[PDB]
Design a protein around this ligand. Structure first.
Ligand SMILES: Cc1nc2ccc(C(=O)NCC(C)C)cc2n2c(-c3cc(OC(C)(C)C)ccc3Cl)nnc12
Ligand SMILES: [Mg+2]
Ligand SMILES: [Zn+2]
Length: 342
């Protein structure tokens, strides 16, 4: 068994220093997708240690090692919603911890829950959205469609299934109340990754940012966790052009595969899922304007040091505007043929 061998080294070789992973590993300029996938499990452990969670919560190391590999093994390999997504999302949570002084805003247990939620938040994704679940009458829809957020409820249930696997419950020494609290947090945070959820709380996120964050306000803590989670989920937009270009390729590959399956079921895909209709520059620009930029604008409003993140997202958006003309074929194709017209 490969996982047993991986586990054996992960446990007995010891948790490597974060600075050994990369000199700039804790910088907003670092691209965690640059890390070899074979090194990501060790890096998860390194981050957990560097944030003092292992020490503070007296996490059993054999259990944590098993847990981390189980979570990694719990992602499938669609083009975007795979383990490297969860890892880069978790890495961004670490960056926020290192760069934004979250301990002034959130409880220890809340920040811990956020990071664990980042690792788990897309568990067992099949490369299709919630609507496809319902449309295809999937098992996941049979379970959760009456509640909404079908995939996100599944992601959360998968995280719990991993905890309930023998030798994997990294929380099982917690007090009853802390155990209860952690799982409730993971619920709310993972459910916050449903865009329907974000749209529903957006006015509140705005009011919070307007009046000013009140660390004594429990609803403010919950809203902030949702915002932070969604900013981790979108963190590929905060790197350079190459990263936003690459992730566009990945997510549209994934989208168009869904659309192809929808067409085969005789249904009309959303335009952005339809490879015959989707115009990537416009769709990406729209996603940045309506989803990504307002989330980072909110983050900047709440955290002055998050300003560079918003500015990088806005810049990447402008770069999409600049390259859009390249999606129009001028002259002939690079094979000198108009055969594609037939
Ligand atoms: C690169 C990139 N393009 C996207 C393009 C379109 C959309 C989309 O759903 N548009 C809405 C429909 C109605 C037109 C999302 C996109 N997206 C996300 C994303 C954002 C999410 O929203 C929150 C809850 C804030 C995380 C949730 C899940 C995902 Cl996968 N992540 N990266 C992307
Ligand atoms: Mg998701
Ligand atoms: Zn995600």
């Amino acid at each position: 068994s490969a996982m047993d061998d991986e586990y054996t080294k992960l446990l007995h070789d010891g948790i490597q220093p974060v600075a050994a992973i990369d000199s700039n590993f804790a910088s907003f300029t670092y691209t965690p997708r640059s890390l070899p996938e074979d090194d990501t499990s060790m890096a998860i452990l390194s981050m957990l240690q560097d944030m003092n969670f292992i020490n503070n919560y007296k996490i059993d190391c054999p259990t944590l090692a098993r847990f981390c590999l189980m979570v990694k093994k719990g992602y499938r390999d669609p083009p975007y919603h795979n383990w490297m997504h969860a890892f880069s999302v978790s890495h961004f949570c670490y960056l926020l911890y290192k760069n934004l002084e979250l301990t002034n805003y959130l409880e220890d247990i809340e920040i811990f829950a956020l990071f664990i939620s980042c690792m788990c938040h897309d568990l067992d994704h099949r490369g299709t959205n919630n609507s496809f679940q319902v449309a295809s009458k999937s098992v996941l829809a049979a379970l959760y469609s009456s509640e909404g957020s079908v995939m996100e409820r599944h992601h959360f249930a998968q995280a719990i299934a991993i905890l309930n696997t023998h030798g994997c419950n990294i929380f099982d020494h917690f007090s009853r109340k802390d155990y209860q609290r952690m799982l409730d947090l993971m619920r709310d945070i993972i459910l916050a990754t449903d865009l329907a959820h974000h749209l529903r709380i957006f006015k509140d996120l705005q009011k919070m940012a307007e009046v000013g964050y009140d660390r004594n306000n429990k609803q403010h803590h919950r809203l902030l966790l949702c915002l932070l989670m969604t900013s981790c989920d979108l963190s590929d937009q905060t790197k350079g052009w190459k990263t936003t270009r690459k992730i566009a390729e990945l997510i549209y590959k994934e989208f168009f595969s869904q659309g192809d399956l929808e067409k085969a079921m005789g249904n009309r895909p959303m335009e952005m899922m339809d490879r015959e209709k989707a115009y990537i520059p416009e769709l990406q620009i729209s996603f940045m304007e309506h989803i990504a930029m307002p989330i980072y604008k909110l983050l900047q409003d709440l955290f002055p040091k998050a300003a560079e993140l918003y500015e990088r997202v806005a810049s990447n958006r402008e770069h999409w505007t600049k390259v859009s003309h390249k999606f129009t074929i001028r002259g002939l194709p690079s094979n000198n043929s108009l055969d594609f017209l037939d």
